[PDB]
Amino acid sequence: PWRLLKLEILVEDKETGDGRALVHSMQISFIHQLVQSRLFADEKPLQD
Amino acid sequence: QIPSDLEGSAYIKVSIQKQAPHWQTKLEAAQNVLLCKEIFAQLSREAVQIKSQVPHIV
Protein backbone atom coordinates (compact mmCIF):
# COMPACT_ATOMS: atom_id res chain seq x y z
CA PRO A 1 0.00 0.00 0.00
CA TRP A 2 0.85 3.67 -0.03
CA ARG A 3 2.26 5.87 2.71
CA LEU A 4 1.03 9.42 3.13
CA LEU A 5 4.41 10.99 4.09
CA LYS A 6 3.27 14.61 4.14
CA LEU A 7 -0.22 16.07 3.73
CA GLU A 8 -0.67 19.83 3.55
CA ILE A 9 -3.61 22.18 3.00
CA LEU A 10 -2.92 25.11 0.69
CA VAL A 11 -6.15 27.01 1.39
CA GLU A 12 -5.25 30.19 3.23
CA ASP A 13 -6.75 33.51 4.25
CA LYS A 14 -4.73 35.52 6.73
CA GLU A 15 -7.77 37.43 8.06
CA THR A 16 -10.45 34.88 8.93
CA GLY A 17 -7.77 32.69 10.36
CA ASP A 18 -6.43 35.46 12.56
CA GLY A 19 -2.98 35.71 11.02
CA ARG A 20 -2.42 32.02 11.69
CA ALA A 21 -2.90 28.79 9.75
CA LEU A 22 -6.38 27.81 8.62
CA VAL A 23 -6.08 24.28 10.00
CA HIS A 24 -4.06 23.22 13.03
CA SER A 25 -1.61 20.34 12.74
CA MET A 26 -3.88 18.31 15.02
CA GLN A 27 -6.61 18.27 12.40
CA ILE A 28 -4.13 17.75 9.56
CA SER A 29 -2.78 14.72 11.40
CA PHE A 30 -6.35 13.50 11.90
CA ILE A 31 -7.02 13.70 8.15
CA HIS A 32 -3.65 11.99 7.69
CA GLN A 33 -4.90 9.04 9.74
CA LEU A 34 -8.25 8.97 7.94
CA VAL A 35 -6.78 8.97 4.44
CA GLN A 36 -4.13 6.47 5.56
CA SER A 37 -6.93 4.18 6.74
CA ARG A 38 -8.80 4.53 3.46
CA LEU A 39 -5.54 3.75 1.67
CA PHE A 40 -5.38 0.59 3.77
CA ALA A 41 -8.90 -0.23 2.55
CA ASP A 42 -7.05 -1.24 -0.66
CA GLU A 43 -9.55 -0.13 -3.31
CA LYS A 44 -8.46 1.87 -6.30
CA PRO A 45 -6.75 4.13 -3.80
CA LEU A 46 -5.96 7.42 -5.51
CA GLN A 47 -9.54 8.12 -6.56
CA ASP A 48 -10.69 7.72 -2.96
CA GLN B 1 2.82 37.17 23.96
CA ILE B 2 1.22 39.40 21.34
CA PRO B 3 -2.12 38.31 19.83
CA SER B 4 -1.87 36.87 16.39
CA ASP B 5 -3.57 39.23 13.89
CA LEU B 6 -1.39 41.98 15.41
CA GLU B 7 2.07 40.78 14.48
CA GLY B 8 4.13 42.17 11.67
CA SER B 9 4.03 45.77 10.59
CA ALA B 10 1.26 47.70 8.89
CA TYR B 11 0.90 51.21 7.53
CA ILE B 12 -1.60 53.23 5.54
CA LYS B 13 -0.32 54.20 2.10
CA VAL B 14 -1.95 57.16 0.36
CA SER B 15 -1.22 57.86 -3.28
CA ILE B 16 -2.34 60.14 -6.10
CA GLN B 17 -2.07 58.81 -9.64
CA LYS B 18 -3.32 59.57 -13.15
CA GLN B 19 -4.41 56.04 -13.95
CA ALA B 20 -7.37 53.69 -14.11
CA PRO B 21 13.54 47.79 24.64
CA HIS B 22 13.09 44.28 23.38
CA TRP B 23 9.41 44.08 24.27
CA GLN B 24 9.02 47.82 23.65
CA THR B 25 9.51 47.39 19.91
CA LYS B 26 7.05 44.49 19.73
CA LEU B 27 4.33 46.26 21.69
CA GLU B 28 4.75 49.53 19.79
CA ALA B 29 4.54 47.71 16.46
CA ALA B 30 1.45 45.77 17.49
CA GLN B 31 -0.23 48.92 18.78
CA ASN B 32 0.55 50.65 15.50
CA VAL B 33 -0.98 47.74 13.61
CA LEU B 34 -4.10 48.00 15.76
CA LEU B 35 -4.45 51.71 15.06
CA CYS B 36 -3.99 51.22 11.31
CA LYS B 37 -6.74 48.60 11.37
CA GLU B 38 -8.94 51.05 13.27
CA ILE B 39 -8.28 53.76 10.67
CA PHE B 40 -9.00 51.55 7.70
CA ALA B 41 -12.16 50.14 9.25
CA GLN B 42 -13.43 53.69 9.72
CA LEU B 43 -12.50 54.68 6.17
CA SER B 44 -13.95 51.61 4.48
CA ARG B 45 -17.21 51.81 6.39
CA GLU B 46 -17.58 55.48 5.49
CA ALA B 47 -16.81 54.65 1.87
CA VAL B 48 -19.40 51.91 1.60
CA GLN B 49 -22.26 53.26 3.67
CA ILE B 50 -22.14 57.07 3.58
CA LYS B 51 -23.57 58.53 0.38
CA SER B 52 -21.07 60.93 -1.13
CA GLN B 53 -20.33 62.68 -4.38
CA VAL B 54 -18.35 60.52 -6.89
CA PRO B 55 -18.52 57.23 -4.98
CA HIS B 56 -15.63 55.00 -4.07
CA ILE B 57 -14.64 51.36 -4.50
CA VAL B 58 -13.43 49.26 -1.57
| Pick from A17, A12, A9, A24: nearest CA to B4 | A17
> Closest-CA residue in chain B for A14?
B5
Measure in Å the smallest separation between the Cα of B5 and chain A Cα atoms.
Answer: 5
Q: How many Å apart are CA B4 and CA B30, to the nearest integer?
A: 10
Resolution in A: 3.5
CB atoms within 10 A of CB B50: 9
Q: How many Å apart are CA A7 and CA B17, to the nearest integer?
A: 45
CA distances from B46 to A15, A29, B57 (A): 21, 44, 11
B3's CB contacts (< 8 A; 6+ apart) are A18, B30
> Closest-CA residue in chain B for A15?
B5
- State which approach was used to obtain the coordinates: cryo-EM
